[PDB]
Design a protein around this ligand. Structure first.
Ligand code: SF4
Ligand code: SF4
Ligand code: FES
Ligand code: FES
Ligand SMILES: [Fe+3]
Ligand SMILES: [Fe+3]
Lengths: 633, 633
């Protein structure tokens, strides 16, 4: 079980699943070995009915696609479609929120409102929307319309790119024709250019993919902006994570997926109906989070994080999960089958994301509170059915300090310098107390023992005084292994980094340091890390590709993460990836993504499967950036 | 060579390529056998980096995707992405034309203009744009803005769906939630819903694909509408097709691709520079067409059709093709490699469609005429280099009568009944002179001996008094085998059909019949066939799924054609396909697409690889429709 997951709670449930004969993601992975080498290297194409075509990585025929498509065209086309699909996921999430805000300020969905008025006003002015002398509802309606307008061509490029990056970065990207003209416009253009008999030049294709990855960046940043307006900007909070946050005597309700439009309401309504849940024999309604929508409500409300990503089925295996409430993205469809064995009520809520065998509850913002009631009443009903059943909840949980929005980080720094809050951070970068900054992002992947890369790389960087921030299931991995607990700062952090986390935490009325890793939220909240390092760049008067800042998608899986890794490279960051995407079948494509893209954007991918080597390479990249500033290292 | 292509000119060039050692699409197909059975059945998924995943069609493990995705989810997700890619191709074509019209009427591209003022006005009123008292340039600017607005969400659904189909059809589609909200919106939503951990219900997934196929229909219809405004509505013309239309002593220039924004200008400018081409030793500039952009200029200007689709490389093998001018879609990237051997100058012109090793000429509508000059001067230069070389142009060509827009067909019928032009056609449907209508559409496919299915099926239907219309490379196959020559009516057509083609042709001042097959234009001009059968439905007061009308994508290949076959089914047509798409790995998915979709839209796919059986099945479908009207058959 150790080779499957480094999480001891996950290992315990893996033993339970094995003895009850419940097939898991790891069993399904084992049944799939050896995986197809053509698909693993990227040398397969099904873009037309003359296929499927493949290309031998080495040896004799086939050496070329039936239409004449070369290995480098086929590899670049497949990558582009992955970026476009990721963009479409983050795009759809942000679009849903844009519609939710518009409905709310037009009086159509009273369950939603402008919760963060100061974020609303700062966004409107970043966009150049006039605020002075306007109702909030009219400013918000303007912001929502501007959001929806970034999805298509108009007289301006995508403002959720051009107004969020340093102007020097925007100029460099414009010179290469990489600024998106519209979010869905770019997605559609990728799908066109990669279809049969279209674009057949690897470099041209990859440039289109960089541009589409910035459409994904725009979607993430818009998603974060809109969610903060509607639901509040995160501020530091304390909670717990891992399976031990389930309680045998409560109605345990998992919010799972990505979009909090639904799960933020479930959080609110669940408070009301705990009276209704005592009547069924529960202590209350124990809302817990899985994946990114769990991160959303953990970041805003302190909802304990139950589990993440590859291990999401294990929460059900406890026998104590009465309902799991789905919106979309990263939901293993196996949960619908597994629930027949574990008793859990699996509920889908979104029209374009249903799973055969799960109960569907049509959710609409106009009727959000009634929907939450209907769903939570199914959860309460399920809790009654398993009264007197034995459950096996592993007694394993960690303390999690989270909620580090960019606004919260700046506010926390302002206690050391009120008029120049970024200067203390830059000060300790310059003098070596902070070697640099590393963002961990992305998913877990069944190919990698769960959390192994995240924790191994994090341990090394923290010892070397790197300030580590994390999002999505990367934050999930670190939070479940204690990296978000301030009690662990002495163990994990080098003395320079320790000094800075202590100084900031003490000045923020804590008596104790900041946690070893700053949790910056969900996957769309990778945009928060952009807003932070962009402000650092603007305060220093340099571009992002001169900052000692790197990223690591240490165990990535989803097309969304492929898009994120690509826009990390596109905005100038050295970007480590811990699972090879299907590009090794083309040396020219691999060479562009790991080397020569440096000459376009200043960022580059770092392909490294071994996490100890990965950390060395990430430290080397941080130290090259320090040298380019003339800093000691 | 007979097993490769039924076209004798193609066979001759295949012999030349074999003896000169030039690899062809058929050789590349042979080098790819046996093709992967997982991809051929649809049982492969690469939508995340835990893959590639496959499922054994029969036997033991693997039986399920690593995430839990079933065979039916994996098959439906792959199909949806094919529909979305096809939609994106037709979408991009139409968008380019919408931008071209807007530039033209804003004074930015003087090389373009409103050539068809009566089409402009009829479109504006179908859309509800006011014409009375408005400049043409303001009506057109309104139409162009309405076109661009159909790509995104707005207060109306996609008007290039809702205003082009019978209102009874729109109501049926709306009740199933199938009307697109925006063209690129639907494409992006497909890409989202099919990514990992999203939509996992085959029926839900396929309904989304039907809706996305109507976004493709909208793109085709918009493309046809806009091209007719800018370049003229087709009217009957006479020309020739097949390789014998090349001339050894001329500068032979192939326009290849799909979008005529470029090639319509090449046609115009080539006339001017024939003086400049005599000076180099040519008789003139011989512009010939390949694929759909060749259909565009064949339909409007009588440009002879050189070849099509799978055989496009053969035009180069003659040694007489001095330039081949590309825009996008269905261009075998092998032409760039092959040109090193044949002398041809291969020129790409569009930013998102380049081929490594081809010369790129940046085309912009603002500078269209200068670009045509630069390109044609490269063609003239190439003609000089091969002076005194031997060429082998097969002396094989057919007469082609084409240009049957829906407006031309209605006008031709109006000579038999001026106030009720559709009534003579319906009259002869009712009395049996016309058994029904069959549309042939789509590509050739290397898997099928070229044109074999198109001609075999057409011969049988025409003998049985079916009125046959054709588009794209389906029209290409029929036109190269004599089906567009009126001299062939006695051989091919049954007496009832013969009577009607003769009566119409005689009444249109021809002394002779209409040709055996009515050429309705390029692939986007499949929308013309919709406009015709929609008018027939509205005149009869019934929906499309009650008309004796069918379609056959007899040899289809491209994702564009997959989308077209799907919207043919979605608007209510029995739709034969002659190559299996990757769906046979899921019985439930196959059963939906071939049977139970009948209960949603009234259309259905007819899977039939054997063309004689196909014709029987198409005749059976036509005759069922006749019986449902109470007609004899
Ligand atoms: S697009 Fe080319 S390489 Fe891909 S399946 Fe079709 S023929 Fe093969
Ligand atoms: S989405 Fe599911 S079936 Fe597809 S590659 Fe990923 S794990 Fe495999
Ligand atoms: S041949 Fe296995 S991924 Fe296509
Ligand atoms: S296993 Fe061959 S198409 Fe993927
Ligand atoms: Fe996740
Ligand atoms: Fe073609």
């Amino acid at each position: 079980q150790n080779l499957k997951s480094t999480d001891r709670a996950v290992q315990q449930m893996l033993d339970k699943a094995k003895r009850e004969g419940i097939q898991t993601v790891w069993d399904r992975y084992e049944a799939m070995k050896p995986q197809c080498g053509f698909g693993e290297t990227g040398l397969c194409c099904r873009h037309c009915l003359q296929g499927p075509c493949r290309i031998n990585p080495f040896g004799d025929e086939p050496k070329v696609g039936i239409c004449g498509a070369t290995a480098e065209v086929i590899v670049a086309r497949g990558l582009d479609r992955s970026i476009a699909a990721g963009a479409a996921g983050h795009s759809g999430h942000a679009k849903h929120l844009a519609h939710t805000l518009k409905k709310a300020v037009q009086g159509k969905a009273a369950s939603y409102m402008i919760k963060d008025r100061t974020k609303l006003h700062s966004i409107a002015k970043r966009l150049g929307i006039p605020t002075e002398g306007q109702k909030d509802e009219d400013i918000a309606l303007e912001v929502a319309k501007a959001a929806l307008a970034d999805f298509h061509e108009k007289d301006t490029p995508v403002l959720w790119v051009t107004t969020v990056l340093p102007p020097s970065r925007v100029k460099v990207l414009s010179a290469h024709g990489l600024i998106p003209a519209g979010i869905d416009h770019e997605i559609a253009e990728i799908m066109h250019r990669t279809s049969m008999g279209c674009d057949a030049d690897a470099q041209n294709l990859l440039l289109g993919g960089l541009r589409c990855s910035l459409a994904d960046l725009a979607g993430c940043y818009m998603g974060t902006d809109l969610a903060d307006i509607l639901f509040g900007t995160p501020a530091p909070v304390v909670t717990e994570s891992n399976l031990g946050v389930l309680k045998a005597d409560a109605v345990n309700v998992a919010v799972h997926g990505h979009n909090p439009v639904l799960s933020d309401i479930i959080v609110s309504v669940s408070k009301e109906m705990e009276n209704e849940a005592r009547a069924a024999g529960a202590t209350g309604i124990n809302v817990v989070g899985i994946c990114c929508t769990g991160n959303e409500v953990l970041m805003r409300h302190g909802i304990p994080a139950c589990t993440h990503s590859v291990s999401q089925e294990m929460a059900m295996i406890t026998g104590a999960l009465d309902a799991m409430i789905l919106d979309y993205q990263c939901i293993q469809p196996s949960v619908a089958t597994i629930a027949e064995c574990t008793g859990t009520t699996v509920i889908t809520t979104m029209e374009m994301s249903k799973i055969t065998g799960a109960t569907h509850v049509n959710f609409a913002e106009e009727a959000a509170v009634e929907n939450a009631k209907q769903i939570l009443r199914l959860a309460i009903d399920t809790f009654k059915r398993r009264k007197g059943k034995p459950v096996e909840i592993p007694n394993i949980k960690t303390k999690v300090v989270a909620g580090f929005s960019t606004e919260a980080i700046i506010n926390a720094l302002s206690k050391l310098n009120a008029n120049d809050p970024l200067k203390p951070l830059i000060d300790n970068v310059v003098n070596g107390n902070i070697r640099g900054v590393c963002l961990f992002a992305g998913c877990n992947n069944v190919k990698v023992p769960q959390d192994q890369n995240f924790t191994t790389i994090a341990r090394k960087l923290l010892k070397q005084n790197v300030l580590v921030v994390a999002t999505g299931c990367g934050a999930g991995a670190l939070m479940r292994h204690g990296f978000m607990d301030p009690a662990n700062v002495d163990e994990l952090c080098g003395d320079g980094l320790k000094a800075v986390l202590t100084a900031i935490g003490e000045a923020n009325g804590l008596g104790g340091p900041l946690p070893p890793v700053l949790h910056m939220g969900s996957c769309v909240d990778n945009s928060r890390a952009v807003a932070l390092v962009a402000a650092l760049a603007n305060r220093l008067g340099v571009d992002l590709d001169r900052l000692p800042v790197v990223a690591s998608a240490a165990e990535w899986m989803h097309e969304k993460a492929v898009a994120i890794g690509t826009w990390a490279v596109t905005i100038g960051l050295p970007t480590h990836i811990g699972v090879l995407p299907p590009i090794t079948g083309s040396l020219p494509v691999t060479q562009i993504l790991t080397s020569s893209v440096k000459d376009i954007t200043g960022g580059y991918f770092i392909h490294e499967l071994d996490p100890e080597t990965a950390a060395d390479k990430l430290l080397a990249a941080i130290n090259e950036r320090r040298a380019g500033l003339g800093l000691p290292w």
